[PDB]
Amino acid sequence: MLGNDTVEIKDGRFFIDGYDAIELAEKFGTPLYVMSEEQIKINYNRYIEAFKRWEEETGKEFIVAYAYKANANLAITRLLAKLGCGADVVSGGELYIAKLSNVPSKKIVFNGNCKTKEEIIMGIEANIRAFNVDSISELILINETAKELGETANVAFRINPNVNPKTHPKISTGLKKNKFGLDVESGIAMKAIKMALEMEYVNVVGVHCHIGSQLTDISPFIEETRKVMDFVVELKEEGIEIEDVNLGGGLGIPYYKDKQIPTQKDLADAIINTMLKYKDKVEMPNLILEPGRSLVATAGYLLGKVHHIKETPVTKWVMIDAGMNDMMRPAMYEAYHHIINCKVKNEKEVVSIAGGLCESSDVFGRDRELDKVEVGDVLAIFDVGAYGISMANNYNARGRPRMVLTSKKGVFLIRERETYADLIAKDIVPPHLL
Amino acid sequence: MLGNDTVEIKDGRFFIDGYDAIELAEKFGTPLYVMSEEQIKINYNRYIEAFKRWEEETGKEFIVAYAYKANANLAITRLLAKLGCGADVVSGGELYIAKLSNVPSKKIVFNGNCKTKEEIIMGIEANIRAFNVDSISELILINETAKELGETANVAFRINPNVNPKTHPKISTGLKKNKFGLDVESGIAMKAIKMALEMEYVNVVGVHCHIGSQLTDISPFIEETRKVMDFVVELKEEGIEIEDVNLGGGLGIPYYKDKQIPTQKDLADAIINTMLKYKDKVEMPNLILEPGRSLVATAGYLLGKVHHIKETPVTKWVMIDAGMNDMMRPAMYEAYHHIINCKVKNEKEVVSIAGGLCESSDVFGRDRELDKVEVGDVLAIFDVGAYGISMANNYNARGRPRMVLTSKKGVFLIRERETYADLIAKDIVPPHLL
Ligand SMILES: Cc1ncc(COP(=O)(O)O)c(C=O)c1O
Ligand SMILES: Cc1ncc(COP(=O)(O)O)c(C=O)c1O
């Protein structure tokens, strides 16, 4: 139950925000994503409560730029906008959704290693807080585009800080070998920022860093914060001031329910106490974080009805109508999600749970102890609010599923499912093939 | 160039079916999927040519049931139907497309480990050649559903033959621990078939087996055939005859261009020579194969325009507008696809090629030697006709790409691209979030 603050078992049945899950499966059909509006408010409020100390002590702003890549469903993004949340967008599509969700432009940052001219025009016209520049090539394109529109673009720089490889080898290897960011150690990040200060159509406003995802140790974050701030000091020695420090996202969520993991409070104690060590060398900046998974993952549950039970010599398989095309995490990363029967039974058994796609990897969990499974039961797969519907697809010609939002106001359909007609709605047969 | 029979380098430029690739990219936009109609015809003809001896020597039919999971774009499936090809479908969605494509029901087989009652009603009403039964639970549902419709359903049985785990360890493991099929060793397959023989609304027509994918060694197929036929004998001894033997799909294609791999002829020799050895124990049946990848993979090319070149201490990156959401194989399986610049250059360099998504795994190839890359150049990613568009998605809020079909009749848009409005076309904002 760790992290799933709004669900419960009442009278032998599973509930989400007070709504009977099996009844939700019955009214809306399966497979079905259920997103808890209150759980999202709780996750968001944990960040605000944990980090308000930043504004209290420095007088600067603290901004949560929700990472849209985790779930950009329009109702979810409008909910987050209404809570006062910002947006971390990585494409023109996400920027479009953020603006249609009414997220204030000064709370929008644009990340990405292949920003196109059209996307840059869009960000400049929307006057986003900043493009987090990934390369010198991007900086040049932004300054040239800003010049064409007769405007000045705000630019922050995504840097790859000099993380201690002895203490954090995996983080370090990622920063050096992946496609993102401006290497600090080799001098690239300083070269890019000095180039931008000589350009006439960009305005230098910050540095950004994002080190990884599903990190359940506070250590990598402390090291990221130290090395990012060390670079802010290096910039200050060159006479360069930084208005914003954006430390990215990556806080892990409790997929496994048996062990405690670091919370937003732990993250803030770590970040804030580290950044304040530098207050006599540089002015404290506005602080931005880009949580994705840690705002929405625990708010999502995927319900799948059992259509077949199959005993084999090695395992008892339970086949459900949810599948890897609906939620790709287990098939793609062999990632663990907690799974239960929505109905409490007086018998338990160990089974493996699979969807119906042709892919051997279309298995949601193996050797799981669940209350006795019968055809017609509804299973709930926990913690699918992030990289769930956002990576869903039509593999095996299956429509993407419906999604509902459970709220104190009622249960609302927030994503309609796709029909067989939708599967071919972008296909066009040429005359000689009619 | 192995496998890519219809492309060429002419006058320093890449051509697909005689159409200049950079010009296709300029006319239709990038990222762009290009499917070669002639390459599909060539691949299909190789199967028909290779297996013609089956009907010559046995008087029985050889049927190609194209695996729709590889690519079910409506123009592609209508092309295969016009060629006389059958269909291996795994969902109601694929059956739907097959029937709208005019594939005759007599050449349609339905695979899947979680067939729903709704899907079974469709296959029965369409009078498909066979449901490849995956479990006893499915058999029971098929019989009950047929009774309710007043119809008789045709059933084959997907079995897991007694493959030799000493000689084929990887193959034997999958067959035992994977979620598919009826185990032969344990007596489950025989029990399922004898059960069907007693049911009033099902008609027993064959046995099916599918061992894996991208197999570039004939050995596993010989083992598969031998063990499937051994079970056919065991059935004969029980007084049970088998009309169809379907050996699945899985022949590998040449992703790497440096080494020769088994062709359809090699597969036919192994399979037909192995099956004929049973001619004195059982009557030869119709033979069905379910190739997917080997029919369409080499006919598809993905063109991506280069927007940025990025030098870093570890590698020189070329950023293109094709991404993992357009084609997931490199990101999901770290699979290799041949990649070239569409313009021949007087100089080559080693570069890594990535899309623009904010996922570290969104990289198409590393340390590849390409003709000198410049911004604006178009790269071609080979062999994406299978598990390419069929696994495409909207991750990072990116629309799925356009796809064109190059033909002797002209170049036709067979898949329109998704606009920003399409990204949110299934999302619904609840009243209190308006
Ligand atoms: C630059 C950037 N910021 C933030 C995130 C959000 O990560 P998480 O969902 O792990 O918090 C990502 C994930 O890709 C990212 O790439
Ligand atoms: C039963 C079945 N037949 C055929 C195929 C096609 O395989 P390939 O594309 O490797 O030929 C698949 C792929 O999952 C399959 O599951």
Swiss-Prot record, chains A, B:
Binding annotation for pyridoxal 5'-phosphate: S213, G250, E290, P291, G292, R293, Y387
InterPro entries registered for this protein in UniProt: Ala_racemase/Decarboxylase_C, DAP_deCOOHase_LysA, De-COase2_C, De-COase2_CS, De-COase2_N, De-COase2_pyr-phos_BS, Orn/DAP/Arg_de-COase, PLP-binding_barrel
Enzyme Commission designation: 4.1.1.20
Signal keyword on record: no
Database matches in HAMAP family: LysA (MF_02120)
Function: Specifically catalyzes the decarboxylation of meso-diaminopimelate (meso-DAP) to L-lysine.
Protein name stated in the entry: Diaminopimelate decarboxylase
Species assigned in the record: Methanocaldococcus jannaschii (strain ATCC 43067 / DSM 2661 / JAL-1 / JCM 10045 / NBRC 100440) (Methanococcus jannaschii)
Encoding gene (name): lysA
